[PDB]
C-alpha cells in the first residue's frame, strides 16, 4: 500500500484492575470528506484478546479476514489450546515487518488488548514493525492529545478500577472531538474481562460551547 484511500483515526486503550478497555470512533474519512460515517473499527478476537486499528481501512478488512481464519483453525483441533494475547501480538509484528521488507507495506497502526491468566495485556503495533507494551496507548493525534492525560493519572495512581478507567476514556474521547479535524461524535467502547469480550454501542459525547459567547 502506497496511498491510503479511506482512513480512520486515533484509538485509545488503557489497562485497569482485571481488564483492558479500548475505544475508537466510527468514521471512514476519505481525505477531508467524512464519507463512511457508520463503520466498526474494533474486532472481537476469540474470548480474551481484542483488536482495534487505525490507518487504512481496506487493509484492516484484510487482517480481519486472516486473523478470523487462524482462530477458527485452532478451535477445530479441540486440544484445549488457544492463542494468548501476547501470541497475537507476536504474530502480527512479524506480519508487518515482513511486509515492509518487500516495500509494499500495510498502512495501519494497531492496538491489541487482552486479558488472560489474571493478567492484562496492552500492545502496540506500528506500520514499520515497531512494537512495545504499555499501561496506556494512543494512536494518531491521540498520542499528542490524549496521551498526556493518560500518563498523569497513572503516575499519580498506578492502578485503576473499572469505573475510573471507563470514565477516564470518555473524558479523553471528548477532548479529541474538540481539536481533531477527522473526529466524529459517535464512538464505541470495547472491554475485556475474565467474563469475556464486550462491545458497547454507538455512544456519544457532551460538548461545552460557553466560550463562544465570549469575544
Amino acid at each position: 500500500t502506497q496511498n491510503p484511500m479511506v482512513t480512520g483515526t486515533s484509538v485509545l486503550g488503557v489497562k485497569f484492575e482485571g481488564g483492558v478497555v479500548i475505544a475508537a470512533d466510527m468514521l471512514g474519512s476519505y481525505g477531508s470528506l467524512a464519507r463512511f460515517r457508520n463503520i466498526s473499527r474494533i474486532m472481537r478476537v476469540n474470548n480474551s484478546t481484542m483488536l482495534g486499528a487505525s490507518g487504512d481501512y481496506a487493509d484492516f478488512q484484510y487482517l480481519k479476514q486472516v486473523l478470523g481464519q487462524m482462530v477458527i483453525d485452532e478451535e477445530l483441533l479441540g486440544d484445549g489450546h488457544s492463542y494468548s494475547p501476547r501470541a497475537i501480538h507476536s504474530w502480527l509484528t512479524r506480519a508487518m515487518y515482513s511486509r515492509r521488507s518487500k516495500m509494499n507495506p500495510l498502512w495501519n497502526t494497531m492496538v491489541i488488548g487482552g486479558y488472560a491468566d489474571g493478567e492484562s495485556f496492552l500492545g502496540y503495533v506500528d506500520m514499520l514493525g515497531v512494537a512495545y507494551e504499555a499501561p496506556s496507548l494512543a494512536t494518531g493525534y491521540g498520542a499528542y492529545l490524549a496521551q498526556p492525560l493518560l500518563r498523569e493519572v497513572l503516575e499519580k495512581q498506578p492502578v485503576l478500577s473499572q469505573t475510573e478507567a471507563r470514565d477516564l476514556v470518555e473524558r479523553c474521547m471528548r477532548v479529541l472531538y474538540y481539536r481533531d479535524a477527522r473526529s466524529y461524535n459517535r464512538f464505541q467502547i470495547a472491554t475485556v474481562t475474565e467474563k469475556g469480550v464486550e462491545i458497547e454501542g454507538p455512544l456519544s459525547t457532551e460538548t461545552n460551547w460557553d466560550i463562544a459567547h465570549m469575544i
Partner: protein, 191 residues
C-alpha cells in the same frame, strides 16, 4: 459520472448518467454505465472505463460459473465479495468505483459499496462518481426510511438531475433500473 443506488422494501433502485468524457471532450454521448451480472444483480461502475469493463467481465465469468455448480441463485453478498478480491489484490493498478445492488431470495434488496481502496460495506443507499459530491448533502436531508418503489424512482431522478445539471463530467440522459422479485424494469428518462 454519477451513480446512485437506493434499496426499498421490495428490492433496489439503480441509476446513472452517461457522458463518458476524455479530458474536456465527450467521447460517448450515451453510455450504459450499469451492467447486468446475473438475472437479479446489477452493478454500476465508475473510475477508469477500460479497468471496470475488464473487472465486470471477470466477475460475471466467476459468478456465472459458480451458480451452475450449486444449482442455486447466487447471493448479492457473494457477488460483492468477488469485486473486493480483485480490487484489493490489484490495487495500485485499477481505479474502480463499483456499487453492487440487487434482489436476493434469502435477503431481499441489498446495496454494497466498493470504492477505489478495496473495502466493502453495506448501506441503505450509496452514491459515487466524480459528481457525487454535489448532491451529497441533498441526499441525506431528503432520504426517509420506509419508502415505496415509486418514491425511490422519484428520489433518485431528482437526485441525479442536480449533479447532471451542475457537474461538467456528468449529464446526458438518466438510465434507471428497478430490481425486485418479479423482474427488472429498465427505463430511460429525461427531466
Amino acid at each position: 459520472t454519477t451513480i446512485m443506488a437506493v434499496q426499498f422494501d421490495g428490492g433496489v433502485v439503480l441509476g446513472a448518467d452517461s457522458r463518458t468524457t476524455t479530458g474536456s471532450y465527450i467521447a460517448n454521448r450515451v453510455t450504459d454505465k450499469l451492467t447486468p451480472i446475473h438475472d437479479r444483480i446489477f452493478c454500476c461502475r465508475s473510475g477508469s472505463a477500460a479497468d471496470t469493463q475488464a473487472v465486470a467481465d471477470a466477475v460475471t465469468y466467476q459468478l456465472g460459473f459458480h451458480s451452475i455448480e450449486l444449482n442455486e441463485p447466487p447471493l448479492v453478498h457473494t457477488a460483492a465479495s468477488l469485486f473486493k478480491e480483485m480490487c484489493y489484490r490489484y490495487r495500485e493498478d485499477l481505479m474502480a468505483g463499483i456499487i453492487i445492488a440487487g434482489w436476493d431470495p434469502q435477503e431481499g434488496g441489498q446495496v454494497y459499496s466498493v470504492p477505489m481502496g478495496g473495502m466493502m460495506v453495506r448501506q441503505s443507499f450509496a452514491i459515487g462518481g466524480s459528481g457525487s459530491s454535489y448532491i451529497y448533502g441533498y441526499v441525506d436531508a431528503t432520504y426517509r426510511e420506509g419508502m415505496t418503489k415509486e418514491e425511490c424512482l422519484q428520489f433518485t431522478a431528482n437526485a441525479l438531475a442536480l449533479a447532471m445539471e451542475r457537474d461538467g463530467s456528468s449529464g446526458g440522459v438518466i438510465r434507471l433500473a428497478a430490481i425486485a422479485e418479479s423482474g427488472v424494469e429498465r427505463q430511460v428518462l429525461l427531466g
